[PDB]
Amino acid sequence: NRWGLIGASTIAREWVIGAIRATGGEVVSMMSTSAERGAAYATENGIGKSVTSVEELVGDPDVDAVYVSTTNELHREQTLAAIRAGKHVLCEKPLAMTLEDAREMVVAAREAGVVLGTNHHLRNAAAHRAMRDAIAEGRIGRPIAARVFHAVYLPPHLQGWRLERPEAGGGVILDITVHDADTLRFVLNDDPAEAVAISHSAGMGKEGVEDGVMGVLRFQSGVIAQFHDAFTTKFAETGFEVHGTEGSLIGRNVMTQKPVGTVTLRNAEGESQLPLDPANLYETALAAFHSAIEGHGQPSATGEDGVWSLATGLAVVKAAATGQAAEIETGL
Ligand SMILES: NC(=O)C1=CN([C@@H]2O[C@H](COP(=O)(O)OP(=O)(O)OC[C@H]3O[C@@H](n4cnc5c(N)ncnc54)[C@H](OP(=O)(O)O)[C@@H]3O)[C@@H](O)[C@H]2O)C=CC1
Numbered sequence: 001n002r003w004g005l006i007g008a009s010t011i012a013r014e015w016v017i018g019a020i021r022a023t024g025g026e027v028v029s030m031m032s033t034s035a036e037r038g039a040a041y042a043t044e045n046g047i048g049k050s051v052t053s054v055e056e057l058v059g060d061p062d063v064d065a066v067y068v069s070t071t072n073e074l075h076r077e078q079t080l081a082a083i084r085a086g087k088h089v090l091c092e093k094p095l096a097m098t099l100e101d102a103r104e105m106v107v108a109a110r111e112a113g114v115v116l117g118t119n120h121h122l123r124n125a126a127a128h129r130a131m132r133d134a135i136a137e138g139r140i141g142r143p144i145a146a147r148v149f150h151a152v153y154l155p156p157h158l159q160g161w162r163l164e165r166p167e168a169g170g171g172v173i174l175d176i177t178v179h180d181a182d183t184l185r186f187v188l189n190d191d192p193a194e195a196v197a198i199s200h201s202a203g204m205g206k207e208g209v210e211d212g213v214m215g216v217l218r219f220q221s222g223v224i225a226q227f228h229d230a231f232t233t234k235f236a237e238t239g240f241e242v243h244g245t246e247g248s249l250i251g252r253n254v255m256t257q258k259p260v261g262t263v264t265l266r267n268a269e270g271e272s273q274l275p276l277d278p279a280n281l282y283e284t285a286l287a288a289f290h291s292a293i294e295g296h297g298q299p300s301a302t303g304e305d306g307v308w309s310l311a312t313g314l315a316v317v318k319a320a321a322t323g324q325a326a327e328i329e330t331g332l
Pocket of ligand 1: 006007008009010011012031032033034037038069070071072092093094119120121158160161175257
């Protein structure tokens with residue numbers, strides 16, 4: 001029920017603070033490296049305390065759970081503080097910057113007996129759940145190939161850290177390709193095995209920073225999945241498709257943060273749009289996380305889910321950089 005925010009972020013402002021409130025919880029405090037900004041942002045968003053120390057946020061006895069949506073080089077040490085305080089943690093993706101860090105987070109949560117969740121939103125969407133369901137109900141026969149299109153335009157207000165400092169987590173692979181990875185795993189119900197990729201810097205990424213990637217994952221089942229992730233492409237709709245021996249599912253406009261997009265089943269009979277019962281992706285994420293901390297079930301995406309999606313993003317990074325296929329090994 002009662003949250004502390006770490007990070008005065010656009011993600012919490014735009015989506016997660018309201019989803020916490022919509023689903024029965026409260027944000028009692030938050031923490032920013034800036035006294036000035038924290039306090040303005042706490043006022044802007046109806047939060048009663050702001051604080052410039054992590055331990056003050058995390059050791060706040062009125063705080064039950066913590067949301068980490070700081071930049072990526074801070075996810076680990078902050079989520080480890082919350083756990084050491086005995087607070088459950090929803091951490092933003094990518095769960096961390098290295099696999100050893102991500103694994104430590106998952107092992108620390110387990111040993112303290114608190115819930116650790118990665119905020120993969122997409123897997124919450126009715127579109128993706130309906131595709132997961134459709135494949136498990138045989139609607140396409142056996143899956144052969146998937147295709148993910150996540151080439152977007154990074155809006156001017158976000159053209160900051162994402163496009164600089166790859167040492168601090170920027171680049172489109174860590175930011176976006178992690179979502180594709182997790183969404184593939186969710187929908188296909190299967191785990192990737194290796195990646196090949198080619199990345200570029202097509203005018204947005206500063207320095208050695210990629211702003212588009214294309215690649216292919218081999219899944220344990222044998223299915224091959226292509227992805228295109230990009231910050232630079234304004235007029236490319238998003239999409240997620242699975243092609244089977246008896247049907248194709250064609251998701252259009254389904255990779256965004258909003259709860260929109262259609263899913264079309266094509267088979268021998270024709271085409272139709274699968275019926276969707278949509279809801280705000282982060283209200284669903286948060287309702288699940290709230291249930292998890294109450295003892296009922298897991299968060300939508302678990303800390304291990306974020307280890308997998310990171311494992312896949314780092315393979316993709318490696319394959320783009322060396323030109324060599326890269327096995328996805330989580331170490332779990
Ligand atoms: N799952 C999902 O749907 C999404 C997840 N994310 C993830 O959440 C994280 C944050 O993303 P996002 O909210 O888009 O990024 P922002 O850039 O909005 O927020 C990140 C940090 O920027 C700092 N900041 C805010 N305003 C200023 C300013 N005026 N000058 C200097 N620094 C400022 C804040 O620092 P401080 O806290 O110290 O004030 C904050 O921690 C990333 O890990 C990203 O991957 C992002 C979008 C969606």
